Amino acid sequence: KVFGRCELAAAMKRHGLDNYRGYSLGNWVCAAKFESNFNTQATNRNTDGSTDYGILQINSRWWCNDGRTPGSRNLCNIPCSALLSSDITASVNCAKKIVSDGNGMNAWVAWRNRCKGTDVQAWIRGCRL
């Protein structure tokens, strides 16, 4: 499923991501835009052999099991395919665990490079939240 901007913002708010660990809703929308282009089916292979899955591009190195990243962890206790569902519950819950880990949203390379220090509020402008 490819979400619309305001549709995703609303789903993320509903799931309690708005101001989670002090990160405003715009930060999460911005990150999802640049990580996956709002596409729940997005997948990308990393150089170490691990893969990123879903709207928030969650890594099989640490967070999920994709059956092909030998020696990795499954900290969110999920198959990586759960991250590709049209329902974002699994992605959101795993993202909450990631952002609490100690580095905050710096865990997301695209957020650090493209969202951090910018006017992220613009990503929720015009939306009926």
UniProtKB/Swiss-Prot annotation:
One of its GO terms (cellular component) is endoplasmic reticulum. The keyword Secreted applies. The keyword Signal applies. It comes from the Eukaryota. GO terms for molecular function: beta-N-acetylglucosaminidase activity; identical protein binding; lysozyme activity. Keywords: Allergen, Antimicrobial, Bacteriolytic enzyme, Disulfide bond, Glycosidase, Hydrolase, Secreted, Signal. Its main location: secreted. In the egg white and polymorphonuclear leukocytes. It is found in: Secreted. Disulfide bonds join C6-C127, C30-C115, C64-C80, C76-C94. Its EC number is 3.2.1.17. Substrate binds at D101. The active site is at E35, D52. InterPro entries: Glyco_hydro_22, Glyco_hydro_22_CS, Glyco_hydro_22_lys, Lysozyme-like_dom_sf. Lysozymes have primarily a bacteriolytic function; those in tissues and body fluids are associated with the monocyte-macrophage system and enhance the activity of immunoagents. Has bacteriolytic activity against M.luteus. Belongs to the glycosyl hydrolase 22 family. Monomer. Lysozyme C is capable of both hydrolysis and transglycosylation; it also shows a slight esterase activity. It acts rapidly on both peptide-substituted and unsubstituted peptidoglycan, and slowly on chitin oligosaccharides. PANTHER family: LYSOZYME C. This is Lysozyme C. It comes from Gallus gallus. The lineage of its organism: Eukaryota, Metazoa, Chordata, Craniata, Vertebrata.
